[PDB]
Design a protein around this motif. Structure first.
Motif, short mmCIF file in Angstrom:
data_model
loop_
_atom_site.label_atom_id
_atom_site.label_comp_id
_atom_site.label_asym_id
_atom_site.label_seq_id
_atom_site.Cartn_x
_atom_site.Cartn_y
_atom_site.Cartn_z
N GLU A 180 -2.76 69.97 4.37
CA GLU A 180 -2.88 71.41 4.64
C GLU A 180 -1.71 71.94 5.48
OE1 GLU A 180 -7.84 72.04 4.86
OE2 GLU A 180 -6.64 72.21 6.67
N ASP A 213 -7.37 79.52 5.99
CA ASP A 213 -6.20 78.82 6.52
C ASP A 213 -4.91 79.63 6.46
OD1 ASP A 213 -7.66 76.48 7.08
OD2 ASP A 213 -7.58 75.90 4.98
N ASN A 237 -7.19 67.57 0.99
CA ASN A 237 -6.68 68.56 1.95
C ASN A 237 -6.32 69.90 1.29
OD1 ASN A 237 -7.10 66.89 4.24
ND2 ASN A 237 -5.25 65.78 3.87
N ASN A 256 -1.99 75.38 8.30
CA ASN A 256 -2.90 76.44 8.74
C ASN A 256 -2.23 77.38 9.75
OD1 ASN A 256 -4.77 74.99 7.13
ND2 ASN A 256 -5.65 73.93 8.80
N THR A 288 -5.78 73.62 0.93
CA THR A 288 -5.56 74.78 1.82
C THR A 288 -6.43 75.95 1.39
OG1 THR A 288 -3.32 74.18 2.38
CG2 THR A 288 -3.84 76.43 2.71
N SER A 289 -7.31 76.44 2.26
CA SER A 289 -8.25 77.52 1.94
C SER A 289 -7.60 78.90 2.03
CB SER A 289 -9.42 77.45 2.91
OG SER A 289 -8.98 77.88 4.16
#
Lengths: 43, 54
Positions: free
Chosen positions: B29, A10, A4, B31, A6-7
């Motif tokens: 994550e 994102d 997972n 977002n 985080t880009s």
């Protein structure tokens, strides 16, 4: 779940822009005729 | 200024147990996304004869 990551996209919404203007604007030549011709006053 | 941009959340984290003193910890994550607000006119005009105001 071990991938997972985080880009950038994102988080992208959180990043503000920045703008700078040191290259804005331009030089000006003075008018040739007022530089060269002999001035005379007039009423 | 003429328009404003709001950031807002779009995905949430979660968390997990661990087997005994040693086991693999996991990953998550978070977002975000955007909303906008625009601006517009409201206006009115009224006339009066000059002497009436005096």
């Amino acid at each position: 779940p071990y991938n997972n990551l985080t880009s950038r996209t994102d988080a992208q919404a959180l990043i503000p822009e920045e703008v700078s203007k040191e290259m804005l604007g331009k030089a000006t030549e003075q008018s040739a005729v007022l530089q060269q011709f002999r001035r005379i006053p007039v009423g | 200024r003429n328009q404003v941009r709001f950031p807002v959340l779009s995905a949430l984290p979660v968390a997990y147990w661990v087997n005994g003193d040693t086991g693999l910890k996991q990953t998550t994550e978070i977002n975000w996304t955007n909303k906008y607000l625009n601006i517009e006119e409201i206006a009115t005009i009224v006339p009066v004869p000059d002497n009436v105001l005096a």
